[PDB]
């Protein structure tokens, strides 16, 4: 059948700690390949599969900044959502982002994904159209109408059909042994 790629982000605020803890886990189908741990001494995106470390420094330097910055954003997002919900700084809250894409049997594009959850409860989501957002609660509507202002429906749509499908396509052939097993 088809294939898939998923990135799983989690930013939890350690109250009384200046920066929250961050763990990023990437999977291709059901084979993890990358790791970025905030408390790790690396400060760098570490390989986790046997076929991803053949991607040279252009890849590890890329993936680090893209979620070094993804961790930074969630640092201001936990503080922004702390103001949306009238909540206090003694509380310890979690932010969970999952975005990914599905390729078909012929390298095609089949379906894209991006979902956000504040404390395990649905927040804002991406519709199949990839042109519409759905806000689960109220605070996700001040984020829904804020995102349609910068056309974030598109710039997520461009990552999903661009680097995500060509990333997933590039990995399915880089570790072609690992990813078509049974």
């Amino acid at each position: 059948g088809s294939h898939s790629m998923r990135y799983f982000f989690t930013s939890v605020s350690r109250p009384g700690r200046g920066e929250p803890r961050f763990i990023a886990v990437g999977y291709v189908d059901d084979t993890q390949f990358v790791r970025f741990d905030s408390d790790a001494a690396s400060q760098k995106m570490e390989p986790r599969a046997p076929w991803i470390e053949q991607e040279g420094p252009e890849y590890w330097d890329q993936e680090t900044r893209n979620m070094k910055a993804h961790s930074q954003t969630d640092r201001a997002n936990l503080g922004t959502l702390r103001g949306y919900y009238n909540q206090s700084e003694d509380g310890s809250h979690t932010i969970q982002i999952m975005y990914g894409c599905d390729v078909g049997p012929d390298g095609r594009f089949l379906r894209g994904y991006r979902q956000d959850a504040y404390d395990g409860k649905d927040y804002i989501a991406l519709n199949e159209d990839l042109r519409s957002w759905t806000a689960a609660d109220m605070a996700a509507q001040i984020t829904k109408r804020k995102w349609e202002a910068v056309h974030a429906a598109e710039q997520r749509r461009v990552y999903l059909e661009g680097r995500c499908v060509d990333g997933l396509r590039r990995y399915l052939e880089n570790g072609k042994e690992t990813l078509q097993r049974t």
Binding site: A76, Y99, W147, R163
Partner: peptide, 9 residues
Amino acid sequence: VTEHDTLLY
């Protein structure tokens, strides 16, 4: 491949 940039709430 992780996303180039990200959006804040």
